[PDB]
Amino acid sequence: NPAFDMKQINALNGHYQTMIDNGDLQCASYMMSRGGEVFAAESLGEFTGGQKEKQTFQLDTIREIGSLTKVFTAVAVMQLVEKGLLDLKMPVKLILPAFDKPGFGEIKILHLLTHTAGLSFELDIQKAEGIDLTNEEEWINYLVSTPLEYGVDEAWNYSRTGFVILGIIISKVTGVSYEQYVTKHIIEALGLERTYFYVPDTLKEEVCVISEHECVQLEKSHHPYFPNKATSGLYSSLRDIWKLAEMFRNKGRLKDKKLLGRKTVEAMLRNQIKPGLPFYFFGAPREEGGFGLGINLWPAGDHYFMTEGTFSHLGMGWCGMFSDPAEDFTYVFFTPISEFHPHAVLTPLNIVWAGIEL
Amino acid sequence: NPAFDMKQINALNGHYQTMIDNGDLQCASYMMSRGGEVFAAESLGEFTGGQKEKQTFQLDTIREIGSLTKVFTAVAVMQLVEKGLLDLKMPVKLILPAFDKPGFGEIKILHLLTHTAGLSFELDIQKAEGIDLTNEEEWINYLVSTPLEYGVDEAWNYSRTGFVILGIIISKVTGVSYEQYVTKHIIEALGLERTYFYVPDTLKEEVCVISEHECVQLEKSHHPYFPNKATSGLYSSLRDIWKLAEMFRNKGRLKDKKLLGRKTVEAMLRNQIKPGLPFYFFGAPREEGGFGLGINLWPAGDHYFMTEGTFSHLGMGWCGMFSDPAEDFTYVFFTPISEFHPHAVLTPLNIVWAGIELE
Amino acid sequence: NPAFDMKQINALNGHYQTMIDNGDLQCASYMMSRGGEVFAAESLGEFTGGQKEKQTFQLDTIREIGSLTKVFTAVAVMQLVEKGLLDLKMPVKLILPAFDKPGFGEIKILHLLTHTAGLSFELDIQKAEGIDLTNEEEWINYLVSTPLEYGVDEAWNYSRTGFVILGIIISKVTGVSYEQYVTKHIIEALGLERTYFYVPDTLKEEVCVISEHECVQLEKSHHPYFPNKATSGLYSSLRDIWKLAEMFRNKGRLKDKKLLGRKTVEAMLRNQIKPGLPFYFFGAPREEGGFGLGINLWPAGDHYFMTEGTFSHLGMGWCGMFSDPAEDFTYVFFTPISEFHPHAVLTPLNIVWAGIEL
Amino acid sequence: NPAFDMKQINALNGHYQTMIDNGDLQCASYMMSRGGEVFAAESLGEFTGGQKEKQTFQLDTIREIGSLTKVFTAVAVMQLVEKGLLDLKMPVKLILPAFDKPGFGEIKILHLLTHTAGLSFELDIQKAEGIDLTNEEEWINYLVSTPLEYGVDEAWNYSRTGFVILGIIISKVTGVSYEQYVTKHIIEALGLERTYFYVPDTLKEEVCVISEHECVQLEKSHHPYFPNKATSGLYSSLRDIWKLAEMFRNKGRLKDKKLLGRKTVEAMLRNQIKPGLPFYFFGAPREEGGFGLGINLWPAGDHYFMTEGTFSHLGMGWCGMFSDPAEDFTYVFFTPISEFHPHAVLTPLNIVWAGIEL
């Protein structure tokens, strides 16, 4: 029925479990579907932030998705483009007049969505004494006081800053908070049942945490140094991330629920980066590859088993969503882990795609 | 039937109506179709040139199309190629010997059609005192006395004057005026019912004008500073612009009326611009994009919702025609406005294409 | 036998005829009964919507009843209460979760039925360009993005939109359209023969219209800016209006046809408005008076001739139904007119009740 | 586009016009479609009951359809089967207990619908004075007082009486009059424009009448000698009859309007007559042919040009509706004429079907 070699499911489970048993990470989980029907899903190991005793990692365990939050922000931007309230060639200074100054004035909404605005990875919070970075006005003020690392369209440079700005733009043009907009128009519209910007207290002890830092961030009902959670801070679950990926694979629909027009999703999944731009991630060079409107088109093709056209996003944490339209195939996973390790984060995709049959 | 999310019609109507309520423009209208069948069309607002009473903007209201006229000019050139009277690789100097000089002697008809001849955006008429710019020889002579901004095939630089020259070329090889040729072999041949180089007096009152400059230009009957109306000067309607677009989408014919061969249209809709050429519009850089034989292939793809292969032309005024052969989908619109504003002219394209569903 | 002084009929007829002669209105009609038996009924004048030759106003002429439609909606809500599917103290958010937010979360079905939910007279649609207000989901979401005017139980404020919401609630709870429910369970069940949400083309040409606006809405197959016709939009006739009032007067039945239990109608005809509340209609203060479960209990008593306990509903148009249980007496009428005028709408009730004998 | 040889349209117009020229009938009209799209429709001649100046026969002229009314009755019966309220194998005596006697106790509803109940062509009215034939109970008791011509399932014998009984059955199970049920759940549910059991006074002068008997009938508020109009008595128009035929051809639907399920309509168009049964029409034998559930399946095939499976009904007057599902093709016509003549009523079908192309 799913045309999948289930020996690879055995390989996948043994792969995650071997790392869990050797202490490389505390727990892992995944969920995979063909033609929109989940045929394999598993949660392995257990978790603790360091104080309370262990608890079993479950298929429906809520976990922060970090950077994956940017994909929700991207959907929100594109919903506003569909309504004519935004256009991606708008300079940011038209919505946020503090950007009306040399350098920042050339930054357009498209640049933010594609990490080509010339912004650095993050804004240094050490020189942020006396500033309330949670206040929209004081955060924007400090931002435009910081020099840009590049001009526009000079490099792909993954930037947390860029998606905080998009959050502010969404809030400015809708007259509601960034979080309220995404909760109403994406979380509730897609029928996600375990996704929150702020987990209610009745569910905080069920949330997967693996460090005391994650414990503290779970109970803080705000972001410590941003005016919104548009670049990170959503909590979600395997099935909800799965639904998000399947909305994209079906070009904007999930059963009866329509989030975007199909022509809109096709634009979001098209490569938007000018050929020959250098790529960087946290100061280090990265191999170039396609990048959409807030969605990654790499890894795909080349030596990978994922077909060309596979779209994806990782999130530090770690977690990921991968959907291969050519195979109607979708894989989402949680691998909570202190530092990035490709054996846990990326190497399992080889195992999964090697099981796909005709 | 049209496989279109009609919620996007509400959004499109609200978008235009909001700009009309804010005073950003007087009126607007559009017409959209799938598989040759109009399924949504609307006219909003009212118009006046300033002195007369306001009049309701209608779907059949006649309106100047500005540089959309250039697409008629392009069709005419290609028809003459089908007849063997022209070839796109002809040096312009073969037809207009005044071009037989360094720089100008390198210009071919293909360059004019594709805005790669190196001509500036327009000819400065301030130095042209005492010259009858409506006379072909004096105008040509004055043009060739002014420096070329680029060499040929060095840059895409939208040029008003390039298409005035094509009109002259059309007139030369046919022995009729440019306006006569277009009126017989395109306007009437395609059965356009509300399209004119000169609106007859009986229909002038229902012509949308929003400035008395458009009022005085409507009372005219010859372009003030050109020997022809081949770069701009037509008046048309939504239905007639829609027909033109659909002629191209159906590869040269509209039901029983044929204007061009299918191989000719395929060539016209092919990108003709050498790769890596820089692009300029009105002295400022422009994003690179495909451009055909007088018909634009951009915006399309990239971050836009229009499918790659969507062909189009805008026009000052403003209006536009956009047709997506991949979706059998055409959108034509009028947004009469004082100056270009993307929120009125291009942003509505996002609303429209976002409503296209699977056929 | 009806114990009515028929000199009051000549006065009544003279009163309407005089207003017709002076161009105060095009036509008028009425029907009155004692003990369930009609003993006087007349139709006066002619009508045209402005285009066709004048047509004679008849006792069976179909005409829009406007907000008299709200009484049908009230009956339907109460039918669902008898079945256990609705409870008047249910919060709306229980049935329409978009209401689960400040202010809207306090609104109960009782508040909508009694015009005390704090909603404005009409939905502020200023921000509704670009939204399809006939789409039920869009309409709810737009509604809860617009300001409430009062808290709940702070004012009796006649609201068109309260009864649109009740239409939606009826439909959510029964799985059919609001109009389908009412057509089967009230119109057909009471044997109303000339009452329609959408007039058939075979009857359209003889419907009473008095303006171009009424001609246009007659040709409509959907309400222009509501997802249902629960607040306005029924077409009906004197005899059908009379039957509905008589059902209420007989505590839920009309001969052999039962629409409601007697205890249900007793609660509907009981005053439901918390004492001391201000009363507003269309922004102007209104005299306080009893109001039941979607049924008016004012005017009655005081200086009026209608006995205490008389229940009623007016309707823009205008039309009315008034029933006095103490005298077994019902009066329904159509007075089609451009604006309100107490002389045409309310003064005839003096003439009628002054004719009631023992 | 309709793939029709329009020379046959010219031949058809001339055929009717020649008969009008010669005085064989006063007027004629027709309407034909392919794939639901009308592509030719014409009305010819003028009409008078010998009275007024002649009036032009128009495409929208109302005209009695006589026994074509039986098809509305059959749709009504089948609607009630879909609701579980009737079963075609129910004996009539179950609903009308006066049938609980020898002979009449064996008649089932199925017999009535297929003219196999053994009833004569009609009740002899010369022996029905002293009986109110408009009274439902008097008429039934007179019917069961006369002898049956045959037993059940012995002969196909076209019977006016049978469809009057069906009308009474409809009214007994629904609780409304036959005319009210058919008006509300067929005429209006189909969106008919000019179809009435009783023509509004304002429309009477436009109605096509060709004799004084037809004017008398037009003025009568009741059927002269029947308790309902279920066997005859409907007034209709070309487009309405075409809609009726197209509903059958589309298996119960007319665009977004549904009168019957597709399985129900399939059963209605199946031949229901036992093979080898003799056929009789007004005492004179007739050739065998299929007959459905109140729908004729003859003429079709044999020496006719209508494809086998063409379903149809004629109406005294004369009028007819013919629909050939193999060609997606519908023809309806009016030929008001004093007496049946095949050259006017049936022969034109040859002209029409001769024009159908691939």
Query: Which subunits have 3 or more CB–CB pairs within 8 Å of chain A?
Result: B, C
Task: Give me C183's structure tokens.
Answer: 């057509």
For residue B350, the distance in angstroms to the closest alpha carbon of chain A comes to: 6
- C288 vs C273: CA distance, rounded Å: 10
Q: Is D331 within any annotated ligand binding site?
A: no
Best CA proximity match to C77, nearest among C65, C89, C67:
C89
A and D touch per CB criterion (3+ pairs under 8 A): no
Under DSSP, the state recorded for B89 is: T
Give yes or no for a cis peptide into A336 (omega within 30° of 0): no
- Amino acid identity, position C202: T
Grouping H, G, I as helix, E, B as strand and the rest as coil, residue A11 is: helix
Residue C253 to chain D, least CA–CA distance (Å): 17
State the Cα–Cα distance between residues B3 and A199, nearest whole angstrom: 40
Alpha-carbon gap, residue A229 to A235, rounded angstroms: 11
Spatial strand order of the sheet with A156-157 comes to A156-157, A279-281, A284-286
- What is the Cα–Cα distance from A316 to A295, expressed in whole angstroms? 15
Q: Which residues of C sit in the known binding site for succinate?
A: 67, 70, 158, 160, 316
Q: What gap in Å lies between CA B8 and CA C110, rounded to an integer? A: 36
Interchain CB distance below 8 Å, B7 and C129: no
CA D174 to chain C, closest CA, distance in angstroms equals 11
The helix (run of H) or strand (run of E) holding residue D63 is strand D63-64
Report the residue of chain C nearest A181, measured CA to CA: C145
Q: Which backbone phi and psi does C315 adopt, to 5 degrees?
A: -160, 135
Q: How many angstroms separate the Cα of D49 from the Cα of each of B257, D23, D56?
A: 52, 14, 13
CA D148 to chain CA mean position, Å: 24
CATH superfamily of D6-354: DD-peptidase/beta-lactamase superfamily (3.40.710.10)
Which residues of C fall below an 8 Å CB-CB distance to A?
Answer: 130, 141
Neighbours of A15 (CB within 10 A): 19
In angstroms, the CA B243 to CA B330 distance is 10
Q: How far is CA C268 from CA A57, C242, C263, C326, C332, in A?
A: 55, 18, 9, 17, 19
Write the DSSP string, D17-51: HHHHHHTS-SEEEEEEEETTEEEEEEEEEEE-SSS
Per the CB < 8 Å rule, is C131 touching B17? no
Look up residue A282 and give its DSSP letter. Answer: T
| Partner-chain contact C202 D180, CB within 8 Å | no
Residue in C258, C323, C313 with CA at minimum distance from that of residue C33: C323
Tokens representing D273 are 């007559």
The residue of chain B with its CA nearest to that of A268 is B303
User: Which amino acid, B317?
Assistant: G
Which of C129, C135, C142 would best serve as a mutation to test chain B binding (most B beta carbons within 10 A)?
C129
DSSP state of B68: G
Q: How far is C135 from chain B (nearest CA, A)?
A: 9
Q: In angstroms, what separates the C-alpha of C190 from chain D's closest C-alpha?
A: 11
Report the alpha-carbon angle C144-C148-C150, nearest 5. 155
Extended strands (E) in chain B: 27-34, 37-47, 55-56, 63-64, 156-157, 235-236, 253-254, 257-258, 279-281, 284-285, 311-315, 319-324, 329-334
Count other C-beta atoms under 10 Å from residue B138's C-beta.
15
Closest CA to A95 of A182, A175, A185: A175
Strands B257-258 and B279-281, how do they pair?
Answer: unpaired
Q: Answer for the pair D104, D141: CB distance below 8 angstroms, yes or no.
A: no
CB distance C129–B6 less than 8 Å?
no
Of A110, A261, A270, the CB nearest to B355: A261
Beta bridge partners of B254: B257
Q: Are A354 and A346 in contact (CB under 8 A)?
A: no
Chain C contact probe: residue of D83, D182, D188, D196 with most C CBs at under 10 A = D188
Nearest CA in chain C to A185: C141
Judge whether C194 and C236 are in contact, CB under 8 Å. Answer: yes
Q: Which residues of C touch D201 (CB under 8 A)?
A: none
Contact D188 C202 (CB under 8 A): yes
Best mutation target among A80, A85, A179, A184 (most C Cβ atoms within 10 Å) is: A184
Instruction: Say if the Cβ atoms of D196 and C202 lie within 8 Å.
Output: yes
Residues of A in contact with B347 (CB under 8 A): 84, 87
**Chain C neighbors of B42, CB-CB under 8 A:** none
Is B160 among the annotated ligand-binding positions? yes
How many Cβ pairs within 8 Å bridge chains A and B? 61
Q: Which helix (H) or strand (E) segment is C257 a member of?
A: strand C257-258
Q: Which of C55, C191, C201 sits opposite D191 (nearest CB)?
A: C201
Comparing CA positions, the residue from B172, B161, B182 lying closest to residue B74 is B182
Residue A196 to chain B, least CA–CA distance (Å): 28
Which of C104, C143, C145, C146 has the most A C-beta neighbours within 10 Å, making it the best mutation to test the interface with A?
C145
Answer yes or no: are the C-beta atoms of B254 and B246 closer than 8 Å.
yes
Please tell me the distance from the alpha carbon of residue C190 to that of residue C266, in angstroms, as a whole number: 19
**Beta-strand (E) ranges in D139-294?**
156-157, 235-236, 253-254, 257-258, 279-281, 284-286
Contact (CB, 8 A) for B177 and B135 = no
Phi, psi (5° rounding) for residue A52? -65, 160
d(CA A252, CA A245): 10
Q: Decide if B311 contacts B329 (C-beta within 8 A).
A: no
Of B12, B304, B358, the CB nearest to A267: B304
Chains touching B (3+ CB pairs < 8 Å): A, C
Q: How was this structure determined?
A: X-ray
Other CB atoms within 10 Å distance of the CB of residue C136: 20
Q: Residue C164 gets which letter from DSSP?
A: H
Tokens encoding C210: 């008095």
Phi then psi for B291, rounded to 5 degrees?
A: -145, 130
Q: Please enumerate residues of B whose Cβ is less than 8 A from a Cβ of A.
A: 5, 8, 11-12, 15, 301-307, 327, 342-343, 346-348, 350-351, 353-358
Q: What residues of chain C have any CB closer than 8 angstroms to a CB in chain B?
A: 129-132, 135, 138
Q: Which chain B residue's Cα is nearest to C134?
A: B7
In A, which residues are within 8 Å of B11 by CB distance? 82-84
CA dihedral D139, D141, D147, D148 (to 10 degrees): 70
Separation between Cα atoms, residue D182 and residue D168, nearest integer Å = 12
Question: Nearest C-alpha of chain D: how many angstroms from C203?
Answer: 9
**C13 in Cβ contact with C333 (< 8 Å):** no
The kind and range of the H/E element at D286 are: strand D284-286
CB atoms within 10 A of CB D16: 24
Angstrom distance (rounded) from CA D108 to CA D119:
12
Which residues, in sequence order, are bridge partners of residue A281?
A284
Preceding omega of B318 cis (within 30 degrees of 0): yes
Q: Which residues of C touch B28 (CB under 8 A)?
A: none
Cβ distance B347 to A267 less than 8 Å, yes or no, reads no
Angstroms from D196 CA to nearest CA on chain C: 8
- Spatial distance between the Cα atoms of B234 and B243, rounded to a whole number of angstroms: 15
C145 to chain A: closest CA residue: A176
Between β-strands B284-285 and D37-47, what pairing exists: parallel, antiparallel or unpaired?
unpaired
Chain C residue nearest residue D179, CA to CA: C193
Q: Is C201 within 8 Å of D195 when comparing Cβ atoms? A: no
Q: Which H or E element spans position D268?
A: helix D262-268
Are D29 and D43 in contact, with CB atoms under 8 Å apart? yes
Residue in D250, D333, D306 with CA at minimum distance from that of residue D35: D250
Rounded CA separation B330/B313 (Å): 12
Rounded Cα distance between D171 and D228, Å, is 10
C129 interaction partners in chain B (CB closer than 8 Å): 10, 13-14, 17-18
Chains A and B touch (3+ CB pairs under 8 A): yes
Domain positions in chain B: 6-354
Indicate which of C54, C202, C255 best probes the interface with D, i.e. most D CBs within 10 Å of its own CB. C202
Strand partners, B319: B315, B334
CA of A335, closest CA in chain B: separation in Å? 33
CB atoms within 10 A of CB B338: 11
Chain A contact residues (CB < 8 Å to B): 81-84, 87-89, 110, 258, 260-264, 266-267, 270, 272, 293
Q: Which residue bears the tokens 């277009």?
A: B182
Question: Under a CB-based contact definition with an 8 Å cutoff, are residues C295 and C248 in contact?
Answer: yes
A175: CB partners within 8 A, 6+ apart: none
C102 upstream amide cis, omega within 30 of 0: no
Let me know the angle formed at the C-alpha of B113 by B83 and B345, rounded to the nearest 5 degrees: 125
Q: Name A102's Cβ contacts closer than 8 Å, sequence gap at least 6.
A: none
- Neighbors of chain D with 3 or more C-beta pairs under 8 Å: C
Has B67 been labeled as part of a binding site?
A: yes
> What span, in angstroms and rounded, lies between the C-alpha atoms of B190 and B184?
9
